[PDB]
Design an enzyme around this catalytic site. Structure first.
Site, PDB file in Angstrom:
ATOM      1  N   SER A  85       0.849  -1.207   0.000  1.00  0.00           N
ATOM      2  CA  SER A  85       0.000   0.000   0.000  1.00  0.00           C
ATOM      3  C   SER A  85       0.878   1.248   0.000  1.00  0.00           C
ATOM      4  O   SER A  85       0.636   2.190   0.744  1.00  0.00           O
ATOM      5  CB  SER A  85      -0.960  -0.028   1.206  1.00  0.00           C
ATOM      6  N   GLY A 142      -4.756   0.689  -0.110  1.00  0.00           N
ATOM      7  CA  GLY A 142      -5.022  -0.597  -0.769  1.00  0.00           C
ATOM      8  C   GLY A 142      -5.384  -1.763   0.140  1.00  0.00           C
ATOM      9  O   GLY A 142      -6.381  -2.450  -0.068  1.00  0.00           O
ATOM     10  N   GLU A 143      -4.545  -1.989   1.136  1.00  0.00           N
ATOM     11  CA  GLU A 143      -4.689  -3.125   2.013  1.00  0.00           C
ATOM     12  C   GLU A 143      -5.507  -2.855   3.267  1.00  0.00           C
ATOM     13  O   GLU A 143      -5.907  -3.803   3.936  1.00  0.00           O
ATOM     14  CB  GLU A 143      -3.310  -3.700   2.340  1.00  0.00           C
ATOM     15  N   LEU A 144      -5.775  -1.582   3.597  1.00  0.00           N
ATOM     16  CA  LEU A 144      -6.547  -1.289   4.799  1.00  0.00           C
ATOM     17  C   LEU A 144      -7.844  -2.095   4.919  1.00  0.00           C
ATOM     18  O   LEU A 144      -8.131  -2.661   5.995  1.00  0.00           O
ATOM     19  CB  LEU A 144      -6.867   0.198   4.921  1.00  0.00           C
TER      20      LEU A 144
END
Ligand code: FES
Ligand code: FES
Ligand code: FES
Ligand code: FES
Ligand SMILES: [Cl-]
Ligand SMILES: [Cl-]
Ligand SMILES: [Cl-]
Ligand SMILES: [Cl-]
Ligand SMILES: [Mg+2]
Ligand SMILES: [Mg+2]
Ligand SMILES: [Mg+2]
Ligand SMILES: [Mg+2]
Ligand SMILES: [Mg+2]
Ligand SMILES: [Mg+2]
Lengths: 907, 907
Positions: free
Chosen positions: A698, A868-870
Site C-alpha cells: 500500500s 489498498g490493504e486497509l
C-alpha cells in the site's frame, strides 16, 4: 464445417465455423472481438457475456451449433465505442466501476440485457440479474456496478438527461479529492484495452504458444523427461527443459534476511532434480497454438520417484521431518518480538488473562483474469518480457541471474492486467517465457487456464497462531504473548518478511507496553506463498481482534469500549516501539459508537428463533511502504504539444495507478494551471521509466505520489519566468533549457526492525480503520449472511474518491470471502471459482458504508496515506465477532463454513 | 520483434510486430481490419491505401519499420461505419461508385487524404491525385468516383447540405428506371463486405492454406513429382497430386459441339501425363498458412521432358504441327457461315471491294482482386466450394465427374467478388480446392497472387481475321467474305462456341444478303481461353467496323453516312438470317450526327503540327442470352416479417445482381405496394437457389429478370384477396396457403445456329449501340490520348441508371485498354498491372458521354435488354478509326503501342 450467416453488432457476418467451436473463440479469434473477455472458461464468471437473440449467454460455454442461422449477437463493441458511448458505459466511467476493467465488458453487456427486459429495475432486481448470469467482480465489491446500472436506467427512461452522466468539474478546478474519472476507464468499458491474452491473439504468425508440463504429485525426485511423442504432434516446434536454461535456473529471493537459514536461491525456473509442489513446471511445449501446445504437453512423460509430502506447516515443522531442501531445515526463519518487560510475571499477577488458538488459511487471489505473459528478443538484442508483474524492476533482478542475462539485457513491462491482489508481487511466468524466447529466438506467449491460476500461482500463507493478553479489570492491556507458524510452501521469496509482519501487527491498534513473541517460517509442499492484500495483517489481526472480543467478554465489557480504552493516543507506541504518526482511532470509535448501538438494537429487534442477528467490531492497521527508508522517483516532462508526461513505474493491478498519477500531478502543478486531461501517465517499463518500486505494501500513493509531487515542483521551478508566470515549451527549447525534470523522495525517518528484538520504525505512514459487520446466522443450517459492512477509514487526504471508495468496497468483499467461504486446501476441488468459495454478488451486501475520518499525514503527499490493504486487515475478524454476537459461538479457524458453524452451535 | 504504440482509427494500439512485416498484413491479420483490401501486392493498384501521419500510403509496400512510435493510421473502418457514414461514403453510394466494391475502401481513404490537403479540388485535381496514388478501378471507368469526390467536397465545405447525399424517392414510388442505390453499396464503402481472401482470414484454426506447384515451361511430358523436401518444411500438412483425385481428374466442356473433333474432356484438374501451358497446377501444398505453403511449394521437384511449344494459333495450325492432345488435331473445330448467294461472282462484278487482315489479342481481365476460393466437407457429408464462380450450376456439372462426386454431393456458392469480366465463366480454383478438401477432410483455402491471376487464369482468345466487303458505288453492301482463326490455348471449354460468335457478329449491324465465311478453333500452348466481356464481338467487330471505314474511304464517303445507309431497317436480316427485334440504329445515328460533325470541326481547329486530333465511329451489337431457348427460374417468397425474398442464382461479378433483382421485383410487385427496402436478394448457391443460369452473355436482366417478373406476378396472384386487396402472411398461413411461389421464363422463339450454314435465331434480344471516339496522337512519339468517348445505347428500358451508366463507363475504359495498351503475350512481362497496360485514371477521359435511345424489347422484362457487354463490342474500333482520322495511319493489329504507331507514321 458449416456456413452461418448471422448479424454481429448490427453487421451481417458470413461465418465459417466448426459446429463444436466455442462462440468465445469464434468471436475473439475469427472476428477479432477481443472485447469479449475470457477468464474462467467454465461458465462461472460472466466475463464472456454476450447477447444472443435477446438472451445474455456465456460465450465460453456456447457452442456454435446453438447459434441459429440469422441469429443476432451483441458484444461490448456493439454496445458502444469511444466517442459513441452507451449510457451504461458512461455510467460505469462516472461511478468508477472499471478498476482492473476485466469484468466491465461482461457486466455492461449483461446489464444491457437486463434493461432490455426490465427498464426500471430495483437495486435488488439488478443484484438478482448479476447473480443469475454469474457476473463476477473481484475489484469493486459490486456496489459501484449497481450504482452505474441504476443511473444509466434513469437516463434511458428519460427521467434524467444523458449529460448528467458526464463528470462536472468542481470549478475550483481541483481534481485532488474529487470523483474525476480514471484515464483508462473509457478503454476498459469499450473493450479496447488489450490485456495479455488479447495481445497474444494480435501477435504475429510465427509467435510460438507455450504450454506447461506440470508435476501431478506434490513432492518427488525427478529421474528424466521423455519428449519424443510430443515432438511428433501437430504444430509442435520444440520442448524446453532445464537443459535449455542459460543461467542458474533459480529465482533469488533477493532480500533474504541474514538470519534466514536458507540462501534464498531455492526456487527453480524449470524443475531439474526435484518437484517441490503440485503444478511445478518441468517443461514447456512450444507450438503454433495454445491448443496444440496443450495437447502435446499431455504426451510429455516425466519419470519421477514420488516422496512423502508435507501438506501443512505443523507437519513440515515436526522435529524429525525430512528436509524438503536438503541442507536447509524446513523451519528456516524465526523472528522474535521483545518489547518492554518480561511478560510471565505480568500474566501471573494480572486481574484478567485470555488466550486463543487461531488459524487463517491459504486464501486464493482469484482475479477474473488468469495469469498470462509473453516474451521476445528485440532487434536491439535484449530480451523483453510483458506480464502481470506489479514490480518490474524487482522481478528483473529476481530472475536475471537465473535466465542468464545481465540486467541491461532484459526489459520487463507491465501489461494492462485484470487484477492480482498481490500474487504478482512474485514472479510466475516471467522466467518461463524469457527462457523460451532466448532458446527459440522467437516470440513466445503463455496463458494459464483457471486451474493453473489456482494451482500454480502463489497463495496467502496459512498461519497457525496462539495469542494471549493480560489486562486490568478496567480493561487496560498490560502484556501480550504471541506464537505464529507460517506455512510458506516450498519457495522462500519474502517468507521471512511475511513472518516479521506478525511482530509488527499482532495486537496493533493499542498501547501494549510488554510483548514476548516468536514467529517461525516453515517450508512445505503445499502452494508457495505470494503476497495477498494485507500481507500478514489478515492473519495477525484476525488473532488479536478476536482475542480483544474474548477479553471484553471475560471482563463483561462492551467490545467497542474496550477498544476505546486502549486505542493509540499521544505517548503510546506500537508493537515495534514506534510512536504512531497520527491518532485517529478514538475519533473514529466515537463517530461509530451511535451507529454501533443502533445496529445492536436492530439485531435484537429483528432476530427470530431460527435467524439470529449480530454485530461485530474490529480495528485494522497497516503500513504504507516497504520496510525502512523506502524511496521512489518520477520524471515530469513538458512535451512539445504543451501536455505533461509524468514518467513512473507505478504498476497498475487495477487499483488506479493512472488516476493516482494524474490526480497527484494535477495538485502539484496547480500554480501553472495544468488541465487534468493534459497530464499523461506511463506504463511500467524497466528500460524507460524510473525505479518507482513495486505496487506492494500500500505504498505507491505515499512513495511515488511524493516523488511525483517533488518532480512536478521541480518542473514548476524549471518553467518559472523571472518576474512571474511560466515559460512555454518553445521558449525553454529556444533557450536550450531542460524540459524533462527528475524528482525523488525517501522515507528518511524509517528504520528496519531488529533481528533480535523486532523493534524499529519500519514505516513512516500507516493506514488506520474501524470495521463494523452486521450478520444473520440461520441456526438450522449454519449459513451466515453478511447484511452490512461499515469501515471508518483514516486515509489522511483522498487523491481520488472513486478510487478510494472502490478500494474499500473491494477489500470488504474479499473479507467476506476470507471469513465465510474461501480457501485453497484441496488441490482439485478448490481449483475453480465456485469450488474455492468466490463471492458472487448476493454474498456481498448492498450496504457497504464508508466514513472518512482523515487526519493528514506529516510525510504523505498533501497529507495522504495509502488505502489498498486497509480494508482487508481485519474485516473477517469483525464478521466472526458478529457471528459470536449473534449466536454465542466463536469460529477460531477460518473459514466459517456452514457445517463448521453448525457443529459449534450444537456442541 | 518490436513494440509499437500507435493510434489506429482513433484508438491507441499496443502493437507487437516484426519490423520487416508489411503494414497490410499487420492491419488485416493481426488487427482484423479486412477493410484494407489487397489485390496486386506490388504497390500498383491502391486497394490497400491507408492514411499514415497525413500521407496516403500503400500498406502492401510499407514495412512496419516506417511506422514511427506514436504514428496515426486511418483505414476505411476509421473513415465511417454503417449508420455512421462519412460524406465520401454517402457520396459513393449515391453516385454508384461501388460496383464490385473491391477498390472502394482504397479510393475513399485516398480521397479523404486529398480533401484533408485540398478542400476544394477541381475534377482535374481529383484525377491527378488518384493517378499519383495509383488508385485503380476496373469496373467504373473512374467518372463516377470523381463525381462522388466532388459532391462530398461540396458538403464538407458547407456549400451544400449533407442530406442531399441521401437518395430522394421519385415519389411515384417507382425505382425501375431510377438511380436507387444498390443494396450492397453500404457494405462495400465501409469495408464490411467479406471477399474470398477476407473470409480466409476469418476461417477457423485448422483451416489448411494451399499453394500451387506450377509448370515453369509451356509444354512437357511429366515423368514424376518429388515432394520429400517439401514435407519436412515448416507448417506443412501434406502435398496433393493427381493420385489423390477421386474422379476422372478432368473438367468437361459439357456442351462441346458434336462437330468438335475433341471430346471436351481435355483439361486436367491436376496434371498427370502432360503440361499444356505455363502455370498448369501439378500439385497442391497444404500448410498452416499461405506463406508456409508457398515456401514449401518452391521445394517440390517435378521431373519433366520439355516439348516444343506452339505459342500462337498460326504456329499450332500448321499442317504438320504435332498434336498437343494426342489423338485430336490441333484445329479441332470449324464453323461455316453460308447466307444467300455465292459471294465470288458478286465480288467480281461489284463497283467496289475492300479487304483487310486484322488481329485482336490475348486481353487479360485484370480484376483488382486476384482469384481466390475455399472448400470444406459439410457435416451433412457434402463438399462445399465458395469461389468467384459466376455460373455455380454450370461449374458444378463441369467439375463433379472430375472430382468424383455425384451432383447432389457437391455445393457451389458465389462469394462476394472483386470483378471477373468473364474469366469466371471458366472453373479456375474450384476443382483444386474440392480435391484438397476431399483428400484431407479439412477446410482448405487457396488465394492466387497477381502473377498467378495473370498467368494462370484464362484470357480473351486471339483471333487472326481476314474480312472482305463488296458494295455498290452508293455504299450499299452486297456481300461479305470472312476467315478467322481462334487461338484457344490448350483447354477446349466454350472454344467452339466462341468461334461460332464470328459467324454471328462479323459484319453485324447492316443488311448483308450474301455471306461466305469460315471460323476455325485451334489448341495452342499459350493461355487457355476464358470468356472476356464481349466474347467474340471485340474480335469480330474490330475487323468489320475497321473494314467499314476502309470501304467509306475507298468510296469517298463519310463513314457515319455509310453506316446510316446500311444499318438494319425493317425487312433486313442479321448475318444468321434472323430479323432484328427492334430497329434503333438509324435513330441513334441521326441523334449522333450533329455531335459527330461538331467533333470533326473541333479536331480540325485544335490539331497542331505535332498533335493531331481525329474522330472515329463504330457500331456494336451483341446478344442478351446464351444461344437458343435459354431459360431462368426465380422464387418469390413472402416472409413472416412482411419482407419478400426473391430467390435466384443471379451471380454478381460486381455488375449489380442485387439491384437488378430488387429493381425488377419492385416493378413487378407495384400492385401490392412493396417498398424497395423490403425486397431481399439471395447469394448464388446450388443447393438452395434455383438454376437461374450463369452471368454470361449479358443475359441475366433479360432471362432472370423475366423469371423474377413472372415469380412476382405469381406471388401477387397467390396473395390476392377476393373482392380486392391482398392477404397478409399471417392470413395466408392461417388458411394453409403457399407463401413461396415459383416463376419460370424461356426464350421460346430462339434456335441454335446450324452446324453447316451458321443460320439461326440464336437470341431473341440484342443490344445495339453507336460509338464515337475523340483522340489526339503525338506524331513525334506515337502516343494516343483518348480525349472523349460517346456511346449511343439502346437498352430497351433501364432497370437502374446507376447500374447501366456504370456498366457503360467500365466497358468504354476496357475498350481504351484493348485499343492502346493491353495484352498478355509475354508470360513474365505482362504478369503485372503496369506491365500488361492496365488503364490508370489519366488514360480514361473524364468526358464519357452516354445517350440512351431506348426501343422497348418485345421479349424483355418491361422492355429491357441487357447492357453488360455492349460497351466493349467495338469501342476499340472507334478509337483506331479515330487514329486513322487524325493521322492517316491504320493499325490493323491491336494494341496501338506508340512504337507501332510511329513505325506506321514514318513508313
Ligand atoms: S464464464 Fe466465460 S470466461 Fe468465465
Ligand atoms: S473491475 Fe471487476 S474484476 Fe476487476
Ligand atoms: S497497391 Fe497494395 S494491394 Fe495493390
Ligand atoms: S468497383 Fe472499382 S475495381 Fe470494381
Ligand atoms: Cl474453529
Ligand atoms: Cl459446509
Ligand atoms: Cl498493324
Ligand atoms: Cl511502345
Ligand atoms: Mg447514445
Ligand atoms: Mg497510558
Ligand atoms: Mg459434521
Ligand atoms: Mg459525419
Ligand atoms: Mg434494302
Ligand atoms: Mg521500331
Amino acid at each position: 464445417m458449416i456456413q452461418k450467416v448471422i448479424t454481429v453488432n448490427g453487421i451481417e457476418q458470413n461465418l465459417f465455423v466448426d459446429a463444436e467451436a466455442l462462440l468465445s473463440d469464434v468471436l475473439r479469434q475469427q472476428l477479432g472481438l477481443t472485447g469479449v473477455k475470457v477468464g474462467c472458461e467454465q461458465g462461472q464468471c460472466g466475463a464472456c457475456s454476450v447477447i444472443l437473440d435477446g438472451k445474455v449467454v456465456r460465450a465460453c460455454v456456447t457452442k456454435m451449433k446453438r447459434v441459429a442461422d440469422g441469429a443476432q449477437i451483441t458484444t461490448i463493441e456493439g454496445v458502444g465505442q469511444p466517442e459513441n458511448l452507451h449510457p451504461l458505459q458512461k455510467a460505469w466511467v462516472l461511478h468508477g466501476g472499471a478498476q482492473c476493467g476485466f469484468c466491465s465488458p461482461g457486466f455492461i453487456v449483461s446489464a444491457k440485457g437486463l434493461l432490455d427486459t426490465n427498464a426500471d429495475p430495483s437495486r435488488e432486481d439488478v443484484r438478482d440479474w448479476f447473480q443469475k448470469h454469474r457476473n463476477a467482480c473481484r475489484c469493486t465489491g459490486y456496489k459501484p456496478l449497481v450504482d452505474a446500472v441504476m443511473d444509466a436506467a434513469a437516463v434511458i427512461n428519460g427521467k434524467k438527461p444523458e449529460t448528467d452522466l458526464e463528470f462536472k468539474m468542481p470549478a475550483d478546478g481541483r481534481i485532488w479529492g474529487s470523483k474525476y474519472p480514471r484515464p483508462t476507464a473509457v478503454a476498459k468499458v469499450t473493450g479496447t484495452l488489450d490485456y495479455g491474452a488479447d495481445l497474444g491473439l494480435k501477435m504475429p504468425a510465427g509467435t510460438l504458444h507455450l504450454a506447461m508440463v506440470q508435476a501431478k504429485v506434490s513432492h518427488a525426485n525427478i529421474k528424466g523427461i521423455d519428449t519424443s511423442e510430443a515432438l511428433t504432434m501437430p504444430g509442435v516446434h520444440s520442448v524446453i527443459t532445464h537443459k535449455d536454461v542459460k543461467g542458474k535456473n533459480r529465482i533469488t529471493g533477493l532480500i533474504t534476511f541474514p538470519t534466514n537459514k536458507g540462501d534464498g536461491w531455492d526456487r527453480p525456473i524449470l524443475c531439474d532434480e526435484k518437484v517441490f509442489q503440485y503444478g511445478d513446471c518441468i517443461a514447456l511445449v512450444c507450438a503454433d497454438s495454445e491448443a496444440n501446445a496443450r495437447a502435446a504437453a499431455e504426451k510429455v512423460k516425466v519419470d519421477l520417484e514420488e516422496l512423502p509430502a508435507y501438506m501443512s506447516g505443523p507437519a513440515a515443522a515436526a522435529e524429525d521431518a525430512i528436509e524438503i531442501h536438503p541442507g536447509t531445515p524446513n523451519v528456516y526463519f524465526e523472528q522474535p518480538i521483545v518489547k518492554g518487560e518480561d511478560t510471565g510475571p505480568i500474566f501471573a499477577s494480572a486481574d484478567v488473562t485470555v488466550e486463543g488458538d487461531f488459524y487463517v488459511g491459504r486464501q486464493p487471489h482469484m482475479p477474473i483474469e488468469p495469469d498470462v505473459a509473453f516474451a521476445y528478443m528485440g532487434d536491439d538484442g535484449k530480451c523483453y518480457i510483458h506480464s502481470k508483474s506489479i514490480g518490474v524492476h524487482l522481478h528483473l533482478y529476481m530472475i536475471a541471474p537465473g535466465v542468464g542475462l545481465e540486467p541491461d539485457q532484459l526489459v520487463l513491462v507491465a501489461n494492462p492486467m485484470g487484477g492480482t491482489f498481490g500474487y504478482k508481487f512474485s514472479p510466475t511466468s516471467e522466467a518461463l517465457v524469457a527462457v523460451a524466447a532466448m532458446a527459440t529466438g522467437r516470440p513466445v506467449h503463455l496463458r494459464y487456464n483457471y486451474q493453473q491460476q489456482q494451482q500454480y500461482t502463489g497463495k496467502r500463507s496459512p498461519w497457525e497462531m496462539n495469542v494471549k493478553f493480560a489486562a486490568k479489570k478496567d480493561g487496560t492491556l498490560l502484556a501480550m504473548e504471541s506464537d505464529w507458524l507460517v506455512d510458506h510452501g516450498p519457495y522462500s521469496e519474502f517468507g521471512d518478511l511475511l513472518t516479521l509482519r506478525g511482530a509488527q501487527f499482532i495486537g496493533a491498534g493499542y498501547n501494549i507496553p510488554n510483548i514476548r513473541g516468536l514467529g517461525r517460517t516453515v517450508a512445505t509442499n503445499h502452494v508457495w506463498g505470494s503476497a495477498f492484500r494485507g500481507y500478514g495483517a489478515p492473519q495477525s489481526m484476525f488473532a488479536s481482534e478476536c482475542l480483544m472480543d474474548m477479553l471484553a467478554e471475560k471482563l463483561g465489557m462492551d467490545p467497542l469500549e474496550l477498544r476505546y480504552k486502549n486505542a493509540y493516543r499521544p505517548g503510546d507506541t506500537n508493537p515495534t516501539g514506534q510512536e504512531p504518526e497520527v491518532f485517529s482511532l478514538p475519533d473514529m470509535i466515537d463517530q461509530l459508537r451511535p451507529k454501533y448501538q443502533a445496529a445492536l438494537e436492530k439485531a435484537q429487534k429483528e432476530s427470530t428463533a431460527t435467524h439470529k442477528k449480530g454485530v461485530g467490531i474490529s480495528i485494522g492497521v497497516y503500513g504504507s511502504g516497504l520496510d525502512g527508508p523506502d524511496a521512489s522517483e518520477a520524471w515530469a516532462e513538458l512535451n512539445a504539444d504543451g501536455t505533461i508526461t509524468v514518467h513512473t513505474a507505478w504498476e497498475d493491478h487495477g487499483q488506479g495507478a493512472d488516476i493516482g498519477c494524474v490526480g497527484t500531478a494535477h495538485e502539484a502543478l496547480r500554480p501553472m494551471g495544468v488541465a487534468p486531461e493534459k497530464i499523461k501517465f506511463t506504463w511500467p517499463n524497466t528500460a524507460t521509466t524510473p525505479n518507482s518500486g513495486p505496487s506492494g505494501g500500500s505504498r505507491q500513493q505515499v512513495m511515488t505520489g511524493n516523488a511525483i509531487r517533488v518532480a512536478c515542483e521541480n518542473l514548476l521551478k524549471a518553467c518559472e519566468k523571472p518576474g512571474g508566470g511560466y515559460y512555454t515549451y518553445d521558449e525553454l527549447k529556444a533557450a536550450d533549457k531542460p524540459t524533462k525534470i527528475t524528482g525523488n523522495w525517501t522515507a528518511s525517518g524509517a528504520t528496519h526492525c531488529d533481528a533480535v528484538t523486532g523493534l524499529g520504525k519500519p514505516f513512516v505512514v500507516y493506514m488506520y480503520g474501524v470495521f463494523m459487520a452486521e450478520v444473520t446466522v440461520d441456526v438450522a443450517t449454519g449459513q451466515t449472511t453478511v447484511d452490512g459492512m461499515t469501515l471508518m477509514a483514516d486515509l489522511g487526504s483522498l487523491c481520488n474518491q472513486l478510487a478510494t471508495d472502490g478500494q474499500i468496497y473491494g477489500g470488504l468483499a474479499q473479507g467476506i470471502g476470507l471469513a465465510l467461504s474461501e480457501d485453497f486446501e484441496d488441490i482439485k476441488k478448490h481449483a475453480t471459482l465456485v469450488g474455492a468459495g468466490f463471492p458472487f454478488i448476493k454474498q456481498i451486501p448492498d450496504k457497504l458504508d464508508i466514513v472518512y475520518v482523515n487526519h493528514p499525514r506529516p510525510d504523505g503527499p498533501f497529507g495522504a496515506s495509502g488505502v489498498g490493504e486497509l480494508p482487508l486487515t481485519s474485516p473477517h475478524a469483525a464478521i466472526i465477532n458478529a457471528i459470536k454476537s449473534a449466536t454465542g459461538v466463536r469460529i477460531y479457524r477460518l473459514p466459517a463454513y456452514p457445517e463448521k458453524v453448525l457443529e459449534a452451535l450444537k456442541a
